[PDB]
């Protein structure tokens, strides 16, 4: 992976090529939008790191990704992949949420399609014709 | 939560689904206009109606959210454009009958033909055939009757339909708490809560009429000068102090005097600046021209073209059975994908129109940071002005020297520079009183200040004073010759052509102030000026 003209990110948080004699390593594999890539970093007060995957801020390994529009985007439409954009409370690091709960920002119960009742998961909507920062990147977070 | 974040959460699902469903429709709009097929027009109206119905749902669900509740400047203007009632404020069948009139007006104005008085087998539509007569023919009386023909065969058929049209649109406009449907037009430019650049609806009338008094001297320069040239081409047909005959104005209605260059050229033997003889010299293609445009954009500091532009566009005509409409239009579909349908040939005008439509793609790249409803122009006049900056600046021969088409040692005397710029003055200065008269007539008719038996009388008398055009055949009220024009008959506001032409030269001199061009303003190019890139880009990333 270090000697690879195939991955686009390579963000480790060169010496780690031989520094690795550590304990167990976690590999986080997922697919993002090409403009969402900024929010895959520590901090990042935005929709991806607040609601989809929050990252730790002090110790971290590596973050790598690469263009997968030919695989993970469909010309007639990849509406399969979703992402959280509404949640009462931002994520902490290592936290994972699968709750498909109808969002009501006022803390009240919510039965859609009534007022202020939305679904927390927008489809990606990736075609082969979309813009650059709008494709599916297979992200490997280490 | 506060209603502000409820208004944001309403737009949050909107700005990702209306991003989707507009790009659904605009893809289907693209693939029919580039592959003309009955299945593609089926799915274009399938996706276009599902887009409008999804727009129908989210407009009415925003009608539950009052605009006088939120102090956030962004979602105020978002919900304001959402919860406009529009045609929903009349009755259920009255606005449908009103749109049945728009169905029947637009049908027989596109179908309506004129037929020759000696050969009724030879019949002509608006384009081609009749506008070929009204822009190229030399006969006085053949152009005279054909001018009368387009105002008689479809002007009379538009008139009782235009009677019923202007009443129900005014009842539509007054039910949305406006003065008239001229005031519903004037409600477009109004902004509330933005200091310095506020704009009343009365501001639009008075600002157009103010700076038109700056236009009027140079127009009356052009008015008196083309009367002398047309007397020399039409001896004793045109009065020496009387106004221009309306069948001799180079076009169908009087908007452009550009086709008078055959009859109003001072020095017809001086050459014209044409560089297409050098385009084929180095064997250029459309891939050279759009890349040379892209190089001309990046020469001033603008970013390059997207990868998705080169993947998804279509800048040649696709030959056989895959049919494509060849009007050069910039197609902003969504999801960061920008494309242009243009049948680009090896042409100096296709060279300039390439910069024009990709100049709209420049503005598409810069509102892209904004959300979907601020992914627009601010008013209706900022799009075409942005596209025409690159048309004017890259048409100057100093750019044509640097590209290698025109030789760098070639001379540009002011005898050939005035004649080309007077040809452009027939276009730009010719359309400003025509537009000024056009809405001002429309203002008073929808207000009710012009009676129905004085519609056609005030129409042609305003051409006598504003446009300086006496009608050669008098028109009573059986005509609807303003509706003879395509904008009035089919629900267009025409004031945007005025304000764009104002703003594009407010922007050009401000660009030429940023370009620091040493010579004249009509010889000004923005080449290699990084301040001209920053000043242009800056006021382009704001959007609405």
Curated annotation (Swiss-Prot), chain A:
Glycans are attached at residue 3. Residues 67-137 are annotated as: Receptor-binding motif. Residues 1-142 form the BetaCoV S1-CTD domain. Changing residue 106 to A: Partial loss of human ACE2 binding in vitro. Residues 1-142 are annotated as: Receptor-binding domain (RBD). Changing residue 122 to K: In strain: Isolate SZ3; 20fold decrease of affinity with human ACE2; no effect on affinity with palm civet ACE2. It comes from Severe acute respiratory syndrome coronavirus. Disulfide bonds join 12-62, 110-117. The gene is S. This is Spike protein S1. Attaches the virion to the cell membrane by interacting with host receptor, initiating the infection. Binding to human ACE2 and CLEC4M/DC-SIGNR receptors and internalization of the virus into the endosomes of the host cell induces conformational changes in the S glycoprotein. Proteolysis by cathepsin CTSL may unmask the fusion peptide of S2 and activate membrane fusion within endosomes. Changing residue 130 to S: In strain: Isolate GD03 and Isolate SZ3; 20fold decrease of affinity with human ACE2; decrease of affinity with palm civet ACE2.
Swiss-Prot record, chain B:
It catalyses: angiotensin II + H2O = angiotensin-(1-7) + L-phenylalanine; angiotensin I + H2O = angiotensin-(1-9) + L-leucine; bradykinin(1-8) + H2O = bradykinin(1-7) + L-phenylalanine; neurotensin + H2O = neurotensin-(1-12) + L-leucine. Changing residue 1 to P: Increases slightly the interaction with RBD domain of SARS-CoV-2 spike protein. Residues 1-544 form the Peptidase M2 domain. The keyword Cell membrane applies. Changing residue 151 to Q: About 95% loss of angiotensin I cleavage. Changing residue 57 to K: Increases slightly the interaction with RBD domain of SARS-CoV-2 spike protein. Residues 12-23, 64-66, 335-339 are annotated as: Interaction with SARS-CoV spike glycoprotein. GO terms for biological process: angiotensin maturation; angiotensin-mediated drinking behavior; blood vessel diameter maintenance; entry receptor-mediated virion attachment to host cell; maternal process involved in female pregnancy; membrane fusion; negative regulation of ERK1 and ERK2 cascade; negative regulation of smooth muscle cell proliferation. This is Angiotensin-converting enzyme 2. It comes from Homo sapiens (Human). The chain holds residues 19 to 562 of 805 of the full protein.
């Amino acid at each position: 992976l270090y000697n690879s003209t195939f991955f686009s990110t390579f963000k480790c948080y060169a010496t780690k090529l031989n520094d690795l004699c550590f304990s167990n390593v976690y590999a986080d594999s997922f697919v993002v939008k090409g403009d969402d890539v900024r929010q895959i970093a520590p901090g990042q007060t935005g929709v991806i790191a607040d609601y989809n995957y929050k990252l730790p801020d002090d110790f971290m390994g590596c973050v790598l990704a690469w263009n997968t529009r030919n695989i993970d985007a469909t010309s007639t439409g990849n509406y399969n992949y979703k992402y959280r954009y509404l949640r009462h409370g931002k994520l902490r690091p290592f936290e994972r949420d699968i709750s498909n709960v109808p969002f009501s920002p006022d803390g009240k119960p919510c039965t859609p399609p009534a007022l202020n009742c939305y679904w927390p998961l927008n489809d990606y909507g990736f075609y082969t014709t979309t813009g650059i920062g709008y494709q599916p990147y297979r992200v490997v977070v280490l | 939560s506060t209603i502000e974040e409820q208004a944001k959460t309403f737009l949050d699902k909107f700005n990702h689904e209306a991003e989707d469903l507009f790009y659904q429709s605009s893809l289907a709009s693209w693939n029919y206009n580039t592959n003309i097929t009955e299945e593609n027009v089926q799915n274009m109206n399938n996706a276009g109606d599902k887009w409008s119905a999804f727009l129908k749902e989210q407009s009415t669900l925003a009608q539950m959210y009052p605009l006088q509740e939120i102090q956030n400047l962004t979602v105020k203007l978002q919900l304001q454009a959402l919860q406009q009632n529009g045609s929903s404020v009349l009755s259920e069948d009255k606005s449908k009958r009103l749109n049945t009139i728009l169905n029947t007006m637009s049908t027989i104005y596109s179908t309506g033909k004129v037929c020759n008085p000696d050969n009724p087998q030879e019949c002509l539509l608006l384009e081609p055939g009749l506008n070929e007569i009204m822009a190229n023919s030399l006969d006085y009386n053949e152009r005279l009757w054909a001018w009368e023909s387009w105002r008689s065969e479809v002007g009379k058929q538009l008139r009782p339909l235009y009677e019923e049209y202007v009443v129900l649109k005014n009842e539509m406009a007054r039910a949305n708490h406006y003065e008239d449907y001229g005031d519903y037009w004037r409600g477009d430019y109004e902004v509330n809560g933005v200091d310095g650049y506020d704009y009343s609806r009365g501001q639009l009338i008075e600002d157009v009429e103010h700076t038109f008094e700056e236009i009027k001297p140079l127009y009356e320069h052009l008015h008196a000068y083309v009367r002398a040239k047309l007397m020399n081409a039409y001896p004793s047909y045109i009065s020496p102090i009387g106004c221009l005959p309306a069948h001799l104005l180079g076009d169908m209605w009087g908007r452009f005097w550009t086709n008078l260059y055959s009859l109003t050229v001072p020095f017809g033997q001086k050459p014209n600046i044409d560089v297409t003889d050098a385009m084929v010299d180095q064997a250029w293609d459309a891939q050279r021209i759009f890349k040379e445009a892209e190089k001309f954009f990046v020469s001033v500091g603008l970013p390059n073209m997207t990868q998705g532009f080169w993947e998804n566009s279509m800048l040649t005509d696709p030959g056989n059975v895959q049919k494509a409409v060849c009007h050069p239009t910039a197609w902003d579909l969504g999801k960061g994908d920008f494309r242009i349908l243009m049948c680009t040939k090896v042409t100096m005008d296709d060279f300039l129109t390439a910069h024009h439509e990709m100049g709209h793609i420049q503005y598409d790249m810069a509102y892209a940071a904004q959300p979907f409803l601020l992914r627009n122009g601010a008013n209706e006049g900022f799009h075409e002005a942005v596209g025409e900056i690159m048309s004017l600046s890259a048409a100057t021969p100093k750019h044509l020297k640097s590209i290698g088409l025109l030789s760098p040692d070639f001379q540009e005397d002011n005898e050939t520079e005035i004649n080309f710029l007077l040809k452009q003055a027939l276009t730009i200065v010719g359309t400003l009183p025509f537009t000024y008269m056009l809405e001002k007539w429309r203002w008073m008719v929808f207000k009710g200040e012009i009676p129905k038996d004085q519609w056609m009388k005030k129409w042609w008398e305003m051409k006598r004073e504003i446009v300086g055009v006496v009608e050669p055949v008098p028109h009573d009220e059986t005509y609807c010759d303003p509706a003879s024009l395509f904008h009035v008959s089919n629900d267009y506001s025409f004031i945007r052509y005025y304000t764009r032409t104002l703003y594009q030269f407010q922007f050009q001199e401000a660009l030429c102030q940023a370009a620091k061009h040493e010579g004249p303003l009509h010889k000004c190019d923005i080449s290699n000026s990084t301040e001209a890139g920053q000043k242009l880009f800056n006021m382009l990333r704001l959007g609405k």
